[PDB]
Amino acid sequence: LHKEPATLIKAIDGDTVKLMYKGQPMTFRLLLVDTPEFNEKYGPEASAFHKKMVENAKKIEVEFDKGQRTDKYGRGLAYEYADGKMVNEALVRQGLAKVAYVYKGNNTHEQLLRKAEAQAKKEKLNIWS
Ligand SMILES: Cc1cn([C@H]2C[C@H](OP(=O)(O)O)[C@@H](COP(=O)(O)O)O2)c(=O)[nH]c1=O
Numbered sequence: 001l002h003k004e005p006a007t008l009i010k011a012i013d014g015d016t017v018k019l020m021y022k023g024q025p026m027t028f029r030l031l032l033v034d035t036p037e038f039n040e041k042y043g044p045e046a047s048a049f050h051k052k053m054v055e056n057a058k059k060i061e062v063e064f065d066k067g068q069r070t071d072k073y074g075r076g077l078a079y080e081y082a083d084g085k086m087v088n089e090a091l092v093r094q095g096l097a098k099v100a101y102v103y104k105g106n107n108t109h110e111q112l113l114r115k116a117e118a119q120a121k122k123e124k125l126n127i128w129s
């Protein structure tokens with residue numbers, strides 16, 4: 001897998017964001033995770049966390065997996081990195097997302113994310129409190 005450049009257009013919520021990629025505005029949905037919706041418990045905090053992580057970054061990158069790159073809603077499916085740190089893994093590690101939506105052929109970072117989830121759960125963080 002390869003990291004590709006993108007720039008932030010706008011924060012949306014815990015697991016979606018508007019980025020510019022190859023010079024086109026796209027909504028990205030983060031692979032392998034599920035954040036609560038904004039109206040649900042920990043939704044606000046998931047949104048804030050994702051927002052902060054990407055607004056503070058100097059360099060956003062997106063990494064596509066081996067499978068489909070866009071979902072049925074036209075959202076880009078990627079791992080997102082903020083100054084080299086994966087946003088998908090960070091949300092899970094903080095108990096602000098669950099590992100989810102693990103489809104065959106787009107699951108390269110499954111086990112990395114599951115390890116983060118086990119550690120968030122041990123610590124009783126947020127969703128696991
Ligand atoms: C993360 C992800 C979601 N989706 C689709 C599945 C779900 O369809 P449904 O809309 O039919 O429930 C939806 C979940 O996204 P959200 O959690 O953003 O709603 O997005 C994919 O198709 N591929 C993916 O990798």
Ligand SMILES: [Ca+2]
Nearest residue numbers: 034035036037
């Ligand atoms: Ca969601």
